[PDB]
Amino acid sequence: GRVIRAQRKGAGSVFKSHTHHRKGPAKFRSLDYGERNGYLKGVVSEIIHDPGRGAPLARVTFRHPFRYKHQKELFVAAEGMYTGQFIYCGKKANLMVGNVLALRSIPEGAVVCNVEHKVGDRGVFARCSGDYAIVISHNPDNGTTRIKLPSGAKKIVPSGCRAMIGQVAGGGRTEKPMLKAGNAYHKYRVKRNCWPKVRGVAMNPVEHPHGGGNHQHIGHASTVRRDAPPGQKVGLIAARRTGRL
RNA sequence: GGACCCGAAAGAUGGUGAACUAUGCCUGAGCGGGGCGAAGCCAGAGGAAACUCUGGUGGAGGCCCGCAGCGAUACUGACGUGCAAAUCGUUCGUCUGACUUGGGUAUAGGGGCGAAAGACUAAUCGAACCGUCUAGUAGCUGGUUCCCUCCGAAGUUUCCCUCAGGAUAGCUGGAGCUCGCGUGCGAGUUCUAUCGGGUAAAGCCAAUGAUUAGAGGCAUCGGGGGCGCAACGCCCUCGACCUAUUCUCAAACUUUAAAUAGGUAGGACGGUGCGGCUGCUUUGUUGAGCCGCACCACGGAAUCAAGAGCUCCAAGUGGGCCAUUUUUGGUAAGCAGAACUGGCGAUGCGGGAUGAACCGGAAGCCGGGUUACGGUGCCAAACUGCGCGCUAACCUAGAUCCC
RNA sequence: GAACCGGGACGUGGCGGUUGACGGCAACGUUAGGAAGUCCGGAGACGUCGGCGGGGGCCUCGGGAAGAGUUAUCUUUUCUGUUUAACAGCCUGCCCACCCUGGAAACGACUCAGUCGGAGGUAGGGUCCAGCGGCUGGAAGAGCACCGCACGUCGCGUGGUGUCCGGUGCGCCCCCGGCGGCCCUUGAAAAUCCGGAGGACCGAGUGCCGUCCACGCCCGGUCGUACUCAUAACCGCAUCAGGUCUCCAAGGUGAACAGCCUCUGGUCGAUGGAACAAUGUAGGCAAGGGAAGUCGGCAAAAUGGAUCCGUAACUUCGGGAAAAGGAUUGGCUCUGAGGGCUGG
RNA sequence: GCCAACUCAGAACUGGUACGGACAAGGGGAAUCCGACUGUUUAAUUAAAACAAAGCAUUGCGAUGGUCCCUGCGGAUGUUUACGCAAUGUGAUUUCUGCCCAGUGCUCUGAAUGUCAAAGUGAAGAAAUUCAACCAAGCGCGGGUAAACGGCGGGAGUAACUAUGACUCUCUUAAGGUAGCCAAAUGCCUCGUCAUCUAAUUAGUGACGCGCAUGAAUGGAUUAACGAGAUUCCCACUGUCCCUGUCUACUAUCCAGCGAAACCACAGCCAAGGGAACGGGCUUGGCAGAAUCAGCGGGGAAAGAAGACCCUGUUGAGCUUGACUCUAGUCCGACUUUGUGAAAUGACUUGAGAGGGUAGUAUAAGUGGGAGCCGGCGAAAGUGAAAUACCACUACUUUUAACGUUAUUUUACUUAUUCCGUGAAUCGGAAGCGGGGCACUGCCCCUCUUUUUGGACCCAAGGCUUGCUUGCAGGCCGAUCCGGGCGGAAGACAUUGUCAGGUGGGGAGUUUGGCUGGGGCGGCACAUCUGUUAAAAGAUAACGCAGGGUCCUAAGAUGAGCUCAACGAGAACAGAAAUCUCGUGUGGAACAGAAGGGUAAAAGCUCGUUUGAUUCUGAUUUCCAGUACGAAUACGAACCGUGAAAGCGUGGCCUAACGAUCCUUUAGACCUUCGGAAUUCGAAGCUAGAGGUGUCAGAAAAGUUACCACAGGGAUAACUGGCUUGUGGCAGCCAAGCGUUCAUAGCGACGUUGCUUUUUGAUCCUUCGAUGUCGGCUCUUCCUAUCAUUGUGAAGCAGAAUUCACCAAGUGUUGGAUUGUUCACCCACCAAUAGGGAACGUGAGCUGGGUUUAGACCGUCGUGAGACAGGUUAGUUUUACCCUACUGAUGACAGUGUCGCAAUAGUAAUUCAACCUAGUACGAGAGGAACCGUUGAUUCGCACAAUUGGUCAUCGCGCUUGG
Ligand SMILES: [K+]
Ligand SMILES: [K+]
Ligand SMILES: [K+]
Ligand SMILES: [K+]
Ligand SMILES: [K+]
Ligand SMILES: [K+]
Ligand SMILES: [K+]
Ligand SMILES: [K+]
Ligand SMILES: [K+]
Ligand SMILES: [K+]
Ligand SMILES: [K+]
Ligand SMILES: [K+]
Ligand SMILES: [K+]
Ligand SMILES: [K+]
Ligand SMILES: [K+]
Ligand SMILES: [K+]
Ligand SMILES: [K+]
Ligand SMILES: [K+]
Ligand SMILES: [K+]
Ligand SMILES: [K+]
Ligand SMILES: [K+]
Ligand SMILES: [K+]
Ligand SMILES: [K+]
Ligand SMILES: [K+]
Ligand SMILES: [K+]
Ligand SMILES: [K+]
Ligand SMILES: [K+]
Ligand SMILES: [K+]
Ligand SMILES: [K+]
Ligand SMILES: [K+]
Ligand SMILES: [K+]
Ligand SMILES: [K+]
Ligand SMILES: [K+]
Ligand SMILES: [K+]
Ligand SMILES: [K+]
Ligand SMILES: [K+]
Ligand SMILES: [K+]
Ligand SMILES: [K+]
Ligand SMILES: [K+]
Ligand SMILES: [K+]
Ligand SMILES: [K+]
Ligand SMILES: [K+]
Ligand SMILES: [K+]
Ligand SMILES: [K+]
Ligand SMILES: [K+]
Ligand SMILES: [K+]
Ligand SMILES: [K+]
Ligand SMILES: [K+]
Ligand SMILES: [K+]
Ligand SMILES: [K+]
Ligand SMILES: [K+]
Ligand SMILES: [Mg+2]
Ligand SMILES: [Mg+2]
Ligand SMILES: [Mg+2]
Ligand SMILES: [Mg+2]
Ligand SMILES: [Mg+2]
Ligand SMILES: [Mg+2]
Ligand SMILES: [Mg+2]
Ligand SMILES: [Mg+2]
Ligand SMILES: [Mg+2]
Ligand SMILES: [Mg+2]
Ligand SMILES: [Mg+2]
Ligand SMILES: [Mg+2]
Ligand SMILES: [Mg+2]
Ligand SMILES: [Mg+2]
Ligand SMILES: [Mg+2]
Ligand SMILES: [Mg+2]
Ligand SMILES: [Mg+2]
Ligand SMILES: [Mg+2]
Ligand SMILES: [Mg+2]
Ligand SMILES: [Mg+2]
Ligand SMILES: [Mg+2]
Ligand SMILES: [Mg+2]
Ligand SMILES: [Mg+2]
Ligand SMILES: [Mg+2]
Ligand SMILES: [Mg+2]
Ligand SMILES: [Mg+2]
Ligand SMILES: [Mg+2]
């Protein structure tokens, strides 16, 4: 008869993201004439740590195309980039790690990261540490390109979408065991209030479908409907299968 | 309808709280002295080499002892109308981190928040607090205020999600009305004459069923012994079978069959003789009812009759209990359940020492007389009265229906 | 009394015109020493733990002088105080950082630990940075201590002497510097201030144009401000043994803001008196036995610091471990070892 | 030479061996269980094994998305992007994680139309409307999934002693418990069996295992280190105890001052009686003497609370689901937003064409004339149910366009709509400057200037041209022209709105009968019949006794004929039993069913004819209120059956076999009404049936609560007490037998009479505005049905020992292991280790181990919430100062004091050992007493401190730490 924890997540106010010390969103430059037709040079000024994010971020300074001022940007750092390196963004940029190129100019089999979904969205795919996308094939007829996402899914995107050559830096982070609850506490302290987690069978019936009973047990199949209403949809949602491979 | 008065656990609606506590966020603050000695580094020794070893340096850890801080294991100590609606004493866990803490800020009631105890959300939480709907509804508990006088019950029938309730009939009060005065439309009573019954008893030597024992006979058709190869050959034993007897039996057996109790009748609403009506009935004014006329009818058994009949409105009651006799279940019960009557309940009074039911007896306030049951050695009113026997208790002799 | 900040307006003097200073090889220095739209950097500005070093305050030892305490005996001894603010100038120059010469293996330099060097060490000479460092002005005229004269009811009167010279440190509080460890944790923003890139534009010859220089002048609103901050000034119905954030922090013992005693400061506030029955509450002891008591060793007792020797099974090799088990510990008189500065 | 600090290590000497001298400050060891560890938790009874945790595993999701909030609009995750976010399970490491997809879930690019709404389409009708086809999701079917919920049994045969079953086959229901582990925190029996630990062990450990009911991420097994966690043992230690004593402070105490509260019908001495079955009051007795002090915990069924256990109520509430009725969300279809075009594919139209046999070649598929049709067929017959010849139309399978309908797809446009980006900064077309090919002067193909470096980059130089002569100012190029789309993506799809179907414990509301020797479980005594209890009219109870929702066109109606069961005697197979003949035959047969009645030219059996099992309403009986329903009976008014007729027949031979209102549905009338008037549909009325309520005078209805609540109930359970005594316990009577013979020394079968209330039952009288619910500890008293001790009788009593019985309750009846234990069982001593009551004595006397709140784990059960006469661990014990009782203390008792008497009440002593008797009596031996006397001892009681021991704040003396 009580709202369950998963339901209470949506309202927020204690489950909102912790973003006080973050350095701002990481994204490409806004797509403009120079990047659409030629190339624009930038210089990496700093590689910084973004709290709550495994991948490091790189500060890049560009010369504004038509204003007398500096154009400052914050890119997701690709492995191998360094302070003082020159970064080239555009259709005519060379195929080197760190450069941002339109997918039409990236040959098949290349390794890219922070791939745009819509032309000009400034990067949504393959952004986490150690992740990358692979260019599969190009379709000149309809101006679309096929890529392989980190999850293994194959997606078709317009060939005008941009991507950064190389893989995201910071790879191999998750292979290290934490060994203790304190490390997880520190990890999630900067992400959101999602830890520790209480098992549903440890609760009373009033606050979870798994609650209750003189023994700890679910008492009914943990696989639930895709259309099950909130508060009832707990456990393995719309599972096509369960158990080991 | 507030509906005689007071009372629920709940439900609904609209608002108020995160000054406590829970969790997230922002910004500050706080945490002796010791123990163990991880990486990294310096030097030396052994060895053919590989490599091994030794002595130092250094100071890692959700590491250890432990102060402050934070918390609260045991005494199941103290206190337990306390210093205190959670405190006090000793003891105890942790103490550089998932650490402790101030202020700001966010989350508000079927909502929040929860390292999860249904925990916490201002001493309030398995749904807060405040006002209102609201005099919420209760077949349930408790109360329900002057006097005398008269009458005066019921715990039983049927129906009801009915079994602590209600309606219904019965029992009761009030109001009367119609008549009547012994010629009485009457009666919890007898008498006379007539009917029905299957209980008590009795019966099996009567049907059905149950059951003991012998006696006398019988078989080409029972089990055995003897005489026999067998024999529808012979002699006996036990069994069946038949006959006449015999012990003992029945709520769901019975020919017979009481006591008690049940029904009907004993005139004025009768009888007799004529005449009439009918569409009913008959072969038939043959019957069946009914209707007029005429005559007779001493009231047609006893006793009693503080009289008989009729109607309206309505209260309370619908838990009963006890006793002689009849009687079911049960070893039995101050158990449980039925029949008739009476009693207690609703009722005092004398007796049974004492007691709701036993015995007596029922009652306005008094004087006198006499009794009922029960008593007359004292307690304690009335004889140590007049008589006959029995008992002697070295077990507390024995001493009055229910008891 | 002596300073500082912000704002406003001018005057005098100074500074520049090679229109927009000079010096240094350099790091950079000097009180001044152009400039508008536009643009750029820095400060503000940041976690936690460990070692080391510097500064201020405190603690501590000795000598000089002033007063006081003890003095049956000893005590050149015991106690108290012996001070220097903001601000201005000059000097100095920690640990780093930076500059010039030069070119290094027989490698050297170097920290407690590290670390550094042909991307230029060691060495020699310099620049800069901190300071809660030094001297002077402030400022001895003040404050404090001591010794005197005077009114002796009301002179907040009047005068003198001193305030000096050294040591010491794993000492304590605060601040700072520079390294190192930790993170799947990397530990605010803005107001405001400073600096820089550029150079449109701008002036004269005995006066003009500028000037962040020195001195001089004027002004600076509104509200809070007593007191308690707790075993009686807040909450707990109270003058309630509860609860309520934080700053300062002496001596001795001792590892120690442990316990115990003491100095400054505070305080004897818990209604008082007599007696010392039982039963209680809190705190001890008890011959012999040693858990037989009890559901149960509940409670209590036993052990305990430091130094030396020694330490099993098992083990995830990290531990177990202070395993277990043994010895010592006072006082007094000595001995040995472990350092700094100066001088060829 | 001048200064400087406290650390370390040694050596003498020395004290009453004191010396971390106070303070400060681990007890240790050998194992089992759980949890890895650190961390967290029920503020105010549970700190734990519970929660969390790292590690392991599973599930969803690529933004037009997953999960979630929101009335709506819009939001959180998201300053995010799979090394991520979201939803679950297990719980370090090590090792392993077996079989099952049938069930419930979840899931799928699967077959298919079995079912499937609204809208839309077609037919008929005057229309309302009704019929058809088409028809989304979902459901059904199929497939997959167990680190999803969960499950892992039984049977038959089989090895050469037996036993088992390597092996083979089978059933439910998919499989049949694998690796492991165990009387476990999990095992009933159970205190299981063996070993070990002890003197003794329901405890601990190890081992065994058809294990009521162990078992593999509902995780199995182990595990170093850790733990205010549960357990066993050992050393040290002790006032826990034997067994108490003593000391210090504060109280209590007494005084001055000050000064409440709880509680209170009236009150307060007892024994018994009866009584509401436990009185302070009543009855009968015992008794009983002012006024006061300090304690005390027997009683006041003491106080504290309208019992929380249990039951009842037509009272809730938290939670669950396979309960009833709904609902947010979600999926799906239609219409709307919604505009502009082009093609395929499947049906529906018509229109031409091809094909076929259960036995035969064959359309003989179906139809008519065929005797005649256009050399060809019948005209003959082979199959034959039915003819080929010439005509079509009828059914089924099968191709394609002229017209038209319908449905599903593919695709085109952009301005509606939706989404993305930007400080809406170069978008579309063309042309110029440059580079390249060709061949010859044009065509074609390309580019917009920036890539060794951690620099800077803006506000135009220059040329041409005007005002007039420039303080300077105005134009073009530099900087191509033209496009009145900021740049893209999807796009009439999505989205919004309204209806329609599905899903929907996420959420709302509600329900979850009654009777009942408490309630539950069980049963139905709830409608209802027979016999009996039932007491000879009727009526009559119990969860008394023994039993009993249909069936029949005949098993109803009527007429006629006949007589049944059984037995006796006869007839081939044939007999106990087949069929047939005669005789007897009161029903001993049959009549649907339970039982009881009833019936013989019938009520039974056979046959003939039939539908009175018909129509109309009234009356009566049974039930009973003299209501209804059911059932039945007697007339009346009709139409019939049967019989010759009387007559009989209104269902079954009689006594049971069944059903209101509202609604629906059927039958009947030339019936009534639709209210402005007519006709026709439709609807509504009147009379009679049918669909049913079995809780049967008739709601529409699942659980759980140990998180719990309220109104009440002693109308009703869980103690004591009261009745009873079946059961338990303890006695007697008779005498068949036992006892070498002998019923009775000692016993007592078959029978039979009693007593007791320390057993357990039976009951429900008292107590539910509360009488504190096990056991132990302490303390007193009482009983005898006597264990020991004193005195006796008897014996199958030689002695010793033993047994039976009689007076007898004066005295005593113990220390320990296991268990919470009562109980039990062992060890040990002893004279003995008897049995019992006192509210199953005794919690304001203690304790709290167990039962019996809230936390948590296991097993079994349940889908679940949860349950559990199963196990386990942690879990607040309140108040006396009132009255009485009791213990002591003043006082009163007629001046004061001393010495005394004395009723009455209380009472106290107990048992054993040794020596001698005595190696005696007795006895064949073996063995083996006792009296007297002497000396000690046990338990208990009353005192006392010479000695020993204990006690210190003599604060008495000494020593000593820190200041
Ligand atoms: K809710
Ligand atoms: K959290
Ligand atoms: K968890
Ligand atoms: K559950
Ligand atoms: K589980
Ligand atoms: K009324
Ligand atoms: K607060
Ligand atoms: K904070
Ligand atoms: K609420
Ligand atoms: K009632
Ligand atoms: K008879
Ligand atoms: K008979
Ligand atoms: K009534
Ligand atoms: K800050
Ligand atoms: K650091
Ligand atoms: K200052
Ligand atoms: K400048
Ligand atoms: K002030
Ligand atoms: K204050
Ligand atoms: K013990
Ligand atoms: K025990
Ligand atoms: K810890
Ligand atoms: K822990
Ligand atoms: K704990
Ligand atoms: K856990
Ligand atoms: K989303
Ligand atoms: K799972
Ligand atoms: K399955
Ligand atoms: K399945
Ligand atoms: K199966
Ligand atoms: K495991
Ligand atoms: K613990
Ligand atoms: K007083
Ligand atoms: K008496
Ligand atoms: K009720
Ligand atoms: K509740
Ligand atoms: K649409
Ligand atoms: K729906
Ligand atoms: K639901
Ligand atoms: K009939
Ligand atoms: K009913
Ligand atoms: K319920
Ligand atoms: K008995
Ligand atoms: K009772
Ligand atoms: K009660
Ligand atoms: K005991
Ligand atoms: K505890
Ligand atoms: K005298
Ligand atoms: K005496
Ligand atoms: K003495
Ligand atoms: K003494
Ligand atoms: Mg579990
Ligand atoms: Mg707060
Ligand atoms: Mg500790
Ligand atoms: Mg009778
Ligand atoms: Mg009488
Ligand atoms: Mg009289
Ligand atoms: Mg550290
Ligand atoms: Mg010092
Ligand atoms: Mg002076
Ligand atoms: Mg400049
Ligand atoms: Mg207040
Ligand atoms: Mg020291
Ligand atoms: Mg919305
Ligand atoms: Mg479908
Ligand atoms: Mg097995
Ligand atoms: Mg285990
Ligand atoms: Mg009595
Ligand atoms: Mg009550
Ligand atoms: Mg109550
Ligand atoms: Mg009722
Ligand atoms: Mg006949
Ligand atoms: Mg009907
Ligand atoms: Mg004899
Ligand atoms: Mg006796
Ligand atoms: Mg006795
Ligand atoms: Mg289960
Ligand atoms: Mg006496």
Resolution of the experimental structure, in angstroms: 2.1
Within residues 148-177 of protein chain A, the ones with CB less than 7 A from nucleic strand D are: 149-151, 153, 155, 158, 170-174, 177
Strands A111-113 and A133-139: antiparallel
Q: Which of A37, A20, A149 is nearest to A90 (CA)?
A: A37
CA A37 vs. chain centroid, Å, equals 28
Q: Can you tell me the distance from the alpha carbon of A123 to that of A19, in angstroms, rounded to the nearest whole number?
A: 20
Distance CA A192, CA A189 (A): 6
CA–centroid distance, A114 to ligand 49, in Å, is 119
CB-strand contact A199/C, under 7 Å: no
Contact A100, A128 (CB under 8 A): no
Tokens describing residue A178 = 């934490």
- Report CA(A105)–ligand 66 centroid distance (Å): 67
Return left, alpha or beta for A71; rule: phi > 0 is left, psi -120 to 50 is alpha, else beta.
beta
CA of A140 to the centre of ligand 51 (A): 120
Which residues of A in 99-128 have their CB below 7 Å from strand D's atoms? 99, 117-122, 124-128
Give the Cα separation of A20 and A147 in Å (integer). Answer: 35
Residue A71 φ/ψ, nearest 5 degrees: -110, 105
> How far is ligand 60, taken at its centre, from the CA of residue A175, in Å?
79
Q: How many Å from the CA of A109 to C1' of B286?
A: 139
Q: Are strands A144-148 and A154-158 parallel, antiparallel or unpaired?
A: antiparallel
A64 touches strand C (CB under 7 A): no
Q: How many residues does chain A have?
A: 245
Q: How far does residue A185's CA lie from ligand 2's centre (Å)? A: 9
Breaks (C-N over 2.5 A) in chain A follow: none
**Does residue A215 lie within 7 Å of nucleic acid chain B, judged by its CB?**
no
Experimental method, per PDB record: cryo-EM
Question: Residue A149 is encoded by which pair of tokens?
Answer: 């996402």
> Apex CA A32: angle with CA A31 and CA A38, to 5°?
105
Q: Mention every residue, 6+ apart, whose C-beta is less than 8 A from residue A57.
A: A23, A26, A47, A48, A49, A50, A74, A75, A76, A77
Q: Is the CB of A171 under 7 A from strand C?
A: no
Gap from A236 CA to B299 C1', in Å? 113
